[PDB]
Design a protein around this ligand. Structure first.
Ligand code: MG
Length: 238
């Protein structure tokens, strides 16, 4: 049996490192007669390893929603979005996005409008690099005019043919990933004779990242509030 965890918000306070109260609890699990630990999070592995200090507690580490798997701190294997779309359809979605981001009248435009990660293509009309304030400042401009929801409605319809999903990302970006690459993807790597897999996430409701995993019959899911509540949900049942 393996245990599965969301990184940001479930094992650590989001964007910061891991408190020692929690890691002491995981050590007891892999020290309880028959348990292995694995994690799945949207972030690239460098951020994840930074967040958890020790990748060695974890037999299997799945980053970018399981489209990237790691083991004993070696990469092993992981695919890319370009291998899915192909160089042609990509230079179609790309230059439609910039041509739209271009002619869009918003007050502040910056840079890194299209970030290519392994799993997703992050599209953002203001731009990825902007002082944390400009991030929040555009978030409220979004509440007034719903600028970003209008963006997805174009891509979601124009590229309905691409088998593509465009879900609203953070405050300033729309994540663009292939259909069925939510978080249930990491199930593909776990036919390793593992009888029961338990999962722990944050936003396990529809319109959330780890929602599609919970109701995937394959595994029992638990909804936790915060990391201190998580440690409670572990100690209580295990
Ligand atoms: Mg989370």
């Amino acid at each position: 049996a393996i245990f599965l965890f969301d990184v940001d918000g479930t094992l650590t306070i989001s964007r910061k490192t891991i408190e020692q109260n929690v890691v002491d609890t995981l050590l007891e699990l892999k020290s309880k007669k028959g348990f292995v630990l694995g994690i799945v999070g949207g972030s690239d592995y460098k951020k994840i390893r930074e967040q958890i200090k020790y990748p060695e507690i974890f037999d299997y580490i799945f980053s970018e929603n399981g489209v990237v798997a790691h083991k004993n701190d070696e990469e092993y294997f992981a695919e890319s979005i370009v291998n899915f779309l192909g160089e042609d359809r990509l230079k179609k979605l790309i230059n439609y996005s910039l041509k739209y981001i271009a002619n869009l009248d918003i007050p502040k435009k910056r840079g890194t409008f299209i970030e290519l990660r392994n799993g997703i293509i992050n599209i953002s009309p203001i731009g990825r690099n902007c002082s944390q304030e400009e991030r929040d400042e555009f978030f409220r401009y979004n509440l007034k005019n719903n600028t970003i929801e209008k963006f997805r409605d174009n891509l979601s319809k124009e590229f309905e043919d691409f088998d593509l999903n465009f879900s609203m990302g953070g405050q300033i970006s729309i994540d663009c990933f292939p259909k069925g690459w939510d978080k249930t993807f990491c199930l593909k790597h776990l036919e390793n004779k593992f009888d029961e897999i338990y999962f722990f996430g944050d936003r396990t409701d529809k319109g959330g990242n780890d929602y599609e995993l919970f109701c995937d019959k394959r595994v029992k899911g638990y909804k936790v509030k915060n990391p201190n509540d998580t440690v409670k949900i572990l100690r209580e049942n295990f």
